């Protein structure tokens, strides 16, 4: 639901209101109804209520970085002039109620209304499309309440205690109602430990297996050792959900919502999040979280730490005066010392604060903020940067609680002024990369259900390690999760756990870990053999909804948006015009991603082993020399111009710990000899199309992981697939392929198998790796080609061939004005015929 102002709704629905006014005889003609609406007569408000009912409206807030920026809501009239927005969607819209505006659009046609009511409804978009994690979940205030409600504190009024002489158990209640009655009298605190008999809350599975070996049913009473607040919280969850009994940190709430998403339909999730919102607001009101300087505690160890580090700063100054240091080195040493001082002050402040202090309670619960802000507010501001972006040796030892001095404030203003321009400039590079990604993969749509391919990629789930418990792989949640199995998974006894083609959800991964199987084979977009687009089974689970992708999904644009949205968090090239070229220092961020997607030769190139064999290594004044002798092969291979500045690759086995690559080591084909970035073209030449795609995906995901961004591998795979779709012809046999021309691999294989009159006389060709730009700069459609290339040449070539265009390019359809060939626009659904059944029609 959303609140829609009366005056705005009236203008939006004017024609409908006029129709209804004429229908009800309040106006004798369209002109009279128009005059009535314009002059806002008393009666129009009675018809507006009838018209507005059940008519969804789209809400949007530019810029629209991801598809959830436009969402449909059911409008209801409200007084005043400000739109009322549901809090849970703020995160989706990136909106705060401090002056933001929002735009409203009205679907007109029946198809548009159905699309808004089904595809775009807010309650249907709980999960983010980038990683499938819930997005419309409790936040800020709602967390603080739920964190307060479920907290357990020792010594609370009426808390449980054991039996004693002349006294049975003193804190046991016969039902939640009795506990609430006791709380109303002040005898019991909502956060006190109690033992309560629950009969409608399902016991924890481990407790259920013991207490009820025949399975728990409603009405079965069990004694739970918990707090009244936790019982109250657990009543908000679905009835069948096991009792949790835990303090609801934001991470725990995210876990619970994720679990609900898998096991229950979306409607139950929406109702649960609404109930959580209500309870969180109610208990955040009464959590007592307030701010005053009495609550802003300053650690008593700040003085000692500051003088202790001032002594070392004075030592640095003394050594500089003696001539043992240079200016820049002295500045760097002082920066190191004061960073250490700030770190220790932050640790002391974190230790000092009580667990129930509002300032630190707001942070620790995950509701808002981070400990750096708390340290700045109370501990000390720390170091600040020059206009050039370099740290000033002398830090701001004061804290905003104490109040900065004049000079400290003046030097602090530099970074504040810089950030305003930095934030504005950060969006340009992100938009550039996002446009590139959208261009390369706009028309990648799911065209068929199953391609019936046996190929796939191997993904690792865990390492059984040295202990008796295997450790879950950290990358499992974005590599194996949400895939579809290509082959059966068998336990240590050969028993099949999950069938082929099943979705590897969280329960599936947990069961796989229960059997201790470490690696599996999953179908991937990279290995999909579908001629056009990709098939649903290879793509697998839809991140936004959790079900298998429907035929017609616009997966390519979704992947492009998901990859491009977090581009602002990556590090970038320096924005200053002066200075030397920035390639000397590795800016491993958006520049690295751009380098990877464009398939350009890395500026930090490192060689790879063309042949598997043992290594003989030599050193020179400034160059390395690495030779590989193939153990099972013949002639050796030599690399004799590797710069000695680059370090040799480190291997570092668990306990062997070889460290830097040594002579006599063994290297397999595709291994990297020098630290740096492997050349994608060399990898393609040595290993082939399969390994270069894996290499590209690994390299991109490495940067995105290191920079703190979480994106599922399939989104990157969708983009990487488009880069390696052509094969260059070196020599043609019994077919009309011109030499040196680029042909689609599908057409190349099709022609090679079509040449059958004399069997096969294959034309020789090999795959070519292209950047996303060049890949996007080609198409099979002449109407689309006429918008990029010389229109006269394209039209002439199409005319002489008399070839037709099938309207599949999406970008081509918008020129025609014909609806896009994705989602509801594909012919599979556009031509649906609807007829009532004979048994249902009999009632007529």
């Amino acid at each position: 639901q959303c609140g829609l102002p009366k005056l705005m709704a009236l203008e939006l629905f004017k024609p409908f209101v006029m129709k209804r006014l004429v229908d009800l005889n309040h106006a004798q003609n369209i002109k009279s109804a128009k005059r009535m609406v314009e002059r806002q007569r008393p009666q129009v408000w009675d018809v507006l209520e009838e018209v507005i009912a059940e008519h969804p409206v789209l809400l949007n807030r530019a810029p629209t970085l991801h598809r959830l920026g436009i969402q449909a809501f059911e409008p209801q009239l409200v007084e005043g002039k400000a739109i009322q927005l549901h809090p849970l969607v703020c995160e989706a819209f990136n909106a705060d109620f401090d002056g933001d505006q929002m735009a409203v659009h009205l679907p007109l046609s029946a198809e548009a209304q159905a699309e808004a009511r089904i595809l775009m409804l807010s309650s249907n978009n709980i999960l983010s499309p980038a990683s499938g994690k819930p997005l419309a979940m409790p936040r800020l205030d709602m967390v603080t309440g739920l964190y307060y409600l479920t907290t357990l504190v020792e010594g609370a009024t009426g808390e449980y205690q054991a039996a004693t002489k002349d006294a049975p158990e003193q804190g046991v209640y016969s039902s939640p109602a009795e506990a609430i009655m006791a709380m109303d009298r002040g005898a019991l605190s909502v956060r006190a430990k109690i033992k309560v008999r629950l009969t409608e809350l399902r016991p924890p599975t481990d407790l259920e297996a013991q207490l009820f070996e025949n399975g728990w049913k409603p009405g079965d009473a069990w004694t739970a050792e918990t707090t009244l607040g936790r019982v109250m919280f657990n009543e908000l969850l679905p009835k069948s959900y096991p009792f949790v009994n835990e303090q609801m940190h934001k991470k725990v709430q995210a876990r619970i919502i994720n679990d609900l998403a898998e096991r229950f339909p979306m409607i139950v999730v929406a109702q649960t999040v609404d109930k959580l919102k209500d309870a969180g607001f109610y208990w955040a009101t009464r959590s007592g979280v307030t701010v005053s300087m009495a609550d802003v505690l300053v650690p008593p160890q700040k003085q000692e730490i500051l003088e202790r580090h001032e002594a070392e700063a004075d030592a640095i100054e003394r050594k500089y005066q003696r001539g043992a240091l240079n200016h820049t080195e002295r500045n760097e040493s002082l920066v190191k010392i004061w960073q250490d001082a700030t770190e220790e002050v932050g640790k002391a402040l974190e230790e000092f604060y009580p667990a129930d202090n509002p300032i630190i309670t707001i942070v620790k619960s995950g509701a808002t903020g981070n400990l750096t802000q708390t340290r700045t507010l109370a501990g000390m501001k720390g170091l600040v940067t020059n206009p050039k972006g370099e740290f000033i040796p002398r830090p701001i030892k004061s804290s905003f609680r104490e109040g900065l001095t004049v000079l400290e404030y003046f030097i602090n203003t530099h970074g504040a002024r810089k950030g305003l321009a930095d934030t504005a400039l950060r969006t340009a590079d992100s938009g550039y990369l996002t446009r590139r990604l959208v261009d390369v993969s706009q028309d990648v749509i799911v065209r068929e259900h199953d391609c019936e391919t046996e190929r796939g990629i191997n993904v690792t789930l865990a390492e059984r390690g040295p202990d008796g418990t295997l450790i879950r792989d950290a990358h499992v949640e974005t590599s194996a999760f949400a895939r579809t199995l290509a082959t059966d998974a068998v336990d240590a006894n050969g028993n099949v756990i999950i069938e082929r083609g099943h979705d590897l959800g969280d329960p599936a991964i947990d069961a796989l870990l229960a059997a201790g199987i470490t690696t599996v084979k999953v179908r991937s977009v990279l290995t999909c053999t579908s001629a056009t687009g990709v098939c649903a089974m290879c793509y697998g689970r839809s991140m936004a909804t959790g079900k298998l992708v429907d035929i017609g999904e616009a997966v390519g644009i979704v992947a492009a948006q998901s990859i491009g949205e977090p581009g602002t968090q990556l590090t970038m090239r320096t924005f200053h015009q002066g200075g030397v070229t920035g390639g000397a220092d590795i800016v491993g961020g958006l520049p690295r991603v751009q380098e990877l997607f464009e398939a350009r030769v890395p500026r930090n190139k490192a060689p790879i082993a063309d042949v598997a064999g043992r290594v003989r290594l030599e050193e020179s004044d400034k160059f390395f020399k690495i030779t590989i002798v193939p153990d099972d092969g013949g002639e050796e291979v030599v690399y004799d111009k590797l710069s000695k500045r680059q370090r040799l690759r480190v291997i570092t086995h668990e306990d062997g710990t070889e460290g830097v690559l040594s002579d006599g080591d063994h290297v397999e084909v595709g291994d990297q000899l020098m630290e740096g970035a492997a050349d994608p073209h060399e990898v393609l030449r040595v290993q082939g199309p399969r390994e270069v795609q894996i290499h590209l995906v690994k390299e991109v995901q490495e940067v995105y992981r290191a920079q703190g961004v979480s994106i599922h591998d399939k989104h990157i795979e969708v983009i990487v697939r488009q880069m390696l779709r052509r094969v260059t012809i070196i020599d043609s046999g019994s077919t009309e392929f011109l030499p040196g021309s680029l042909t689609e691999r599908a057409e190349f294989e099709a022609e090679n198998r079509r040449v059958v009159a004399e069997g096969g006389e294959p034309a020789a060709g090999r795959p070519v790796l292209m950047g996303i730009t060049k890949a996007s700069l080609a198409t099979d459609s002449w109407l689309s080609a006429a918008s990029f290339q010389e229109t006269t040449r394209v039209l002439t070539d199409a005319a002489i061939n008399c070839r037709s265009d099938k309207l599949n390019g999406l970008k081509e359809n918008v020129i025609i004005g014909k609806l896009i060939p994705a989602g509801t626009g594909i012919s599979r659904y556009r031509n649906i015929q609807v007829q009532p059944t004979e048994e249902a029609r009999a009632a007529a």
Binding site: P168, Y173, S174, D184, R185, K195
Partner: protein, 234 residues
């Protein structure tokens, strides 16, 4: 001054002893004025009988367990607190529960004195083991609301007289909420939804009637200061 429209009270049945009452339309702001008062009146005004102490013969200080029965003393106390008892005595009354031999002992096995009625004889109390027996005496007296177990620190005539919490009020759970409704072109009017779950000894309708009577009774004191002072009228 006449009210804009007379509010109405509708009822819905949610279970055998649970109901939901809707009061609407109310003048803007009166929903919260009525809801909390009704809830507190329901939970603290209606008198009723409850068990205030139980004495088991088989235990002096080993409260953890009682021989001949698998239930803990805590479980016995909880089950007895779940007992629904009514009386017309207005004074403490002693009730004896004695059973022998293996098998389930329930509230129906009780032998109430004259004037005392047990409304849920089918409630399970305990499961007696072989060679086992149960013998307890309960003190039942009337009251209002919820009174935490009174500690008989001065008890010299007995040491095994366990005190227990007394749920006197026949109403067990009440929860209220306030929503907005629209009459004419105004949407400030309030609607009060109050859900009441009561014991078996009284229906929710009777509890609400008694609460309303008590509240009218109490505000009559304020009204009688000057009965002719103009109020909003219905």
């Amino acid at each position: 001054m006449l009210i804009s429209q007379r509010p109405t009270l509708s009822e819905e049945t949610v279970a055998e002893n649970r109901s939901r009452f809707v009061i609407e339309p109310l003048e803007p702001g009166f929903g919260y004025t009525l809801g909390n008062s009704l809830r507190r009146t329901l939970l603290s005004s209606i008198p009723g009988a409850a068990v205030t102490s139980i004495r088991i013969d088989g235990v002096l200080h080993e409260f953890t367990t009682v021989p001949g029965v698998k239930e803990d003393v805590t479980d016995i106390i909880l089950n007895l607190k779940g007992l629904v008892v009514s009386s017309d005595d207005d004074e403490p009354v002693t009730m004896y529960l004695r059973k022998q031999g293996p098998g389930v002992v329930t509230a129906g096995d009780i032998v109430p004195p004259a004037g005392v009625t047990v409304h849920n004889p089918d409630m399970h109390i305990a499961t007696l083991n072989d060679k086992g027996k149960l013998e307890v005496e309960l003190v039942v007296e009337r009251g209002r609301g919820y009174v935490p177990a009174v500690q008989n620190k001065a008890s010299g005539a007995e040491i095994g007289r366990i005190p227990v919490d007394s749920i006197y009020s026949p109403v067990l759970k009440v929860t209220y909420k306030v929503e907005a409704t629209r009459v004419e072109q105004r949407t400030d009017f309030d609607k009060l939804i109050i859900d009441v779950e009561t014991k078996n000894s009284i229906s929710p309708r009777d509890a609400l009637a008694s609460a309303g009577g008590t509240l009218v009774e109490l505000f009559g004191l304020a009204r009688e200061l000057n009965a002719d002072s103009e109020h909003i009228e219905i």
